[PDB]
């Protein structure tokens, strides 16, 4: 059983406050629309 991760799996990569800005960063994130194993 697998489901669609959609657009979740994002977290704050650091402890830095940023506002009204688009910030580009590379870190370990869940790829969008990837498959996640679904357990009951």
């Amino acid at each position: 059983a697998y489901t669609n991760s959609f657009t979740r799996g994002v977290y704050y990569p650091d402890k830095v406050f940023r506002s009204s800005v688009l910030h580009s960063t590379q870190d370990l994130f869940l790829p969008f629309f990837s498959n996640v194993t679904w357990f009951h």
């Binding site: 704050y12 402890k15 830095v16 406050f17 940023r18 506002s19 800005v21």
Partner: protein, 210 residues
């Protein structure tokens, strides 16, 4: 210079102010971890007969940080205290409590003539590779000479155990040289109207500037 509140210290008070100590053959080994380890008390206190460090300077202990620290705690006879050092031989150094020749740590000791010694003799302390834990007892009595007194010896063998960082007062609306946690710089500190999230420590401008 500003750092978080200096709380969460390691329990040196359970090592040096301990009610009971182990013998040298089978000494107690307490692990020191996950704290701000204040060594200024042990260094400056006049309660100790000796304070020596071999791998590090005894006055830099609050600047240094060690992965792990271990407190090897035992009672030995005064004349034999000199054996608790790297590169030594003797009844303790060879058969009871051996240190590495490349030992890094500090050896702290004080007399316990009014604590462990007993009038009829305290014979509960017995003696025979590095830190590798038949036997005879020590006749510890309050009436014997200095070299015959019991001494309480703690060896701190040397990341989660870091020295304390003392903060200064903060002055606003003036040009200062600041140090906040992990960053430094020069600027004027003023009250902001920013709303940081509970886990955010620093703010950043658009072009990667604090």
């Amino acid at each position: 210079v500003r750092f978080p509140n200096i709380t969460n210290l390691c329990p040196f008070g359970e090592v040096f102010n301990a009610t009971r100590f182990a013998s040298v053959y089978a000494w107690n080994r307490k692990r020191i971890s996950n704290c701000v380890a204040d060594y200024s008390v042990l260094y400056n206190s006049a309660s100790f007969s000796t304070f020596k460090c071999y791998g590090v300077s005894p006055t830099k202990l609050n600047d240094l940080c060690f992965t792990n620290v271990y407190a090897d705690s035992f009672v030995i006879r005064g004349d034999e205290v000199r054996q608790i050092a790297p590169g030594q031989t003797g009844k303790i150094a060879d058969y009871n409590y051996k240190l590495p020749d490349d030992f890094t740590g500090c050896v702290i000791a004080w007399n316990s003539n009014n604590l462990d010694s007993k009038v009829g003799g305290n014979y509960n302390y017995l003696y025979r590779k590095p830190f590798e834990r038949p036997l005879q007892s020590y006749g510890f009595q309050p009436t014997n000479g200095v070299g015959y007194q019991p001494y309480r010896v703690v060896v701190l063998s040397f990341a989660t155990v870091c020295g304390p960082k003392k903060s200064t007062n903060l002055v606003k609306n003036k040009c200062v040289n600041f140090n906040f946690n992990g960053l430094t710089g020069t600027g004027v500190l003023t009250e902001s109207n920013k709303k940081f999230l509970p886990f955010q420590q620093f703010g950043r401008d658009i072009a990667d500037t604090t």
